[PDB]
User: Fold nitrogenase iron protein 1 from Azotobacter vinelandii.
Amino acid sequence: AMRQCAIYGKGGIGKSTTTQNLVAALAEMGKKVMIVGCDPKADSTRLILHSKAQNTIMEMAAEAGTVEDLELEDVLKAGYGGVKCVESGGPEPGVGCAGRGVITAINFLEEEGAYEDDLDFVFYDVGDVVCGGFAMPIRENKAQEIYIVCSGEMMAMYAANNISKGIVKYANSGSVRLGGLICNSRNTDREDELIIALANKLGTQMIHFVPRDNVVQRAEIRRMTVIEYDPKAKQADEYRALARKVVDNKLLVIPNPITMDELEELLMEFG
Ligand SMILES: Nc1ncnc2c1ncn2[C@@H]1O[C@H](COP(=O)(O)OP(=O)(O)OP(=O)(O)O)[C@@H](O)[C@H]1O
Ligand SMILES: [Mg+2]
Assistant:
């Protein structure tokens, strides 16, 4: 049955490249997936759809000026490995905040019957907060699992710890949990020991260390994932091991965050 996962983490650390490459690896082995992009600039489905950008629900509900008058085939397009793609977007030419844009997007999907019988995973590519609008990708009938993409810097780790605070302070005792820390590389073999040390302190795991490799940039100027553009690359096998690890994961925790006194100690021990 449908496991609903959501990717959180800091700005610019690699959530949409890790999400799309993980999903491509999942589709390659047989899993049936839907990516729902929860970012104002539609860029969560480009490497799967080979699109310039996908046409958002919030640019087909203000364009068509609807209330309840829009079709699912106009926002759910299939791409590589048969992955289904939805793009929420913001009121990006309009006015306001995103957040709520995700709410009037997975409610649309629910109403239009997008969550079908043979779907294995639904990945939401959200942002930096498990609060309100951006947390209804985590509500009662929604995502059970959260994976935080982070790295060796102070601000990526601080973001992981604060997202983790938002997960313990998820509304009422339903069941939104932390599945692990995906470390997206930036240094060498001391950075992985830093993320493992934070993870053990939060009560999770570093479910995979993703290397920094230029094939990623080569694949995406060509609008693809590394699994599609270059299946035999060592990096492709990195997202397939992350994909295997997420598929077998049974360590959904209710995290135990550290104080800023403690994160500074960990960071001081390293850089
Ligand atoms: N493993 C990697 N190897 C090489 N480059 C990478 C890797 N992971 C991410 N990148 C690159 O670093 C950048 C970060 O990726 P991306 O923009 O998808 O992160 P993001 O957190 O989703 O961004 P945002 O905060 O805007 O939502 C991109 O330019 C991407 O190509
Ligand atoms: Mg992104």
